[PDB]
Amino acid sequence: ANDNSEEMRHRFRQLDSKLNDLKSLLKEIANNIK
Amino acid sequence: ANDNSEEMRHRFRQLDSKLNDLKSLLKEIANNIK
Numbered sequence: 001a002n003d004n005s006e007e008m009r010h011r012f013r014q015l016d017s018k019l020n021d022l023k024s025l026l027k028e029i030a031n032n033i034k
Numbered sequence: 035a036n037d038n039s040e041e042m043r044h045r046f047r048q049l050d051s052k053l054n055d056l057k058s059l060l061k062e063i064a065n066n067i068k
Binding site: 005008009012015016019020022023026027029030033034 | 038042045049052053055056059060062063066067
């Protein structure tokens, strides 16, 4: 049982985690300005 | 009728929505500086 969807899916989850980290940092910078 | 393109496509739309949210926040920070 082999599939390539799960590895690229895990890459999608970790890049989405990096996106949420960037969103958290931008909310932090918006709080630092304001 | 089964396909894996729609679920990764919906993941693409929601990450693109997060990208547009990051772009909106960066335009907001550019307006806050200027």
